[PDB]
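agent: user wants the structure for Heat shock protein HSP 90-alpha from Homo sapiens. delegating to structure tool.
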Amino acid sequence: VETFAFQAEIAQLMSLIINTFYSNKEIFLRELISNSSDALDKIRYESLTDPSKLDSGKELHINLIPNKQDRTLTIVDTGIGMTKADLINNLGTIAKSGTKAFMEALQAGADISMIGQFGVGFYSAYLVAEKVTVITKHNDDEQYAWESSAGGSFTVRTDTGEPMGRGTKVILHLKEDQTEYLEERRIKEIVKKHSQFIGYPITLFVE
Ligand SMILES: COc1ccc(CC(=O)c2cc(Cl)c(O)cc2O)cc1
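agent: tool returned. relaying tokens verbatim.
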């Protein structure tokens, strides 16, 4: 297991997300679904010129998997996935420069719900999760698990568990007081409210 320090700006963003009073937590789901949609767009585009890139799975979709026993909500996509380098590099995002822009917007009347406009929506996961585990498989690499409970560090290891094929799973280990996000009716409500027109099928798994 390798342990890495977050860039200072990202550590600061995560503390802001964790510590700022902000009731509208439900937007985390919209942000993660948007990220999945972006990853699916990428593999779709690459597959246009090289169809073999779908050998690892032709279906382009998103699964939402609640598990009350483990207190987890998992967002799964069959998008492009991430290399080990991608994972370490802030999960393929421009998080350092994005955090700066986001910080400035906040000082200029922006609110936390606009986090996605700055390419750092992933970190909104920490509105509801005490720990986030990201399992990922890119065509060009092995399967990895990224993990962080904030506090300034994240880990990366190879993942020998259930091979995925291609894509990314974001596993939200929910805070004790945020279990509403495991209820079917609540998840449906949030998807309809914020993610109604996503261009890929979203399947909400049943318990
Ligand atoms: C904007 O283009 C990108 C496309 C894909 C990625 C990486 C990626 O696969 C991925 C990253 C995050 Cl955090 C996520 O919640 C879901 C994802 O599926 C990163 C950037």
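agent: one observation worth passing along. The CA atoms of residues 65 and 72 lie 8 Å apart.
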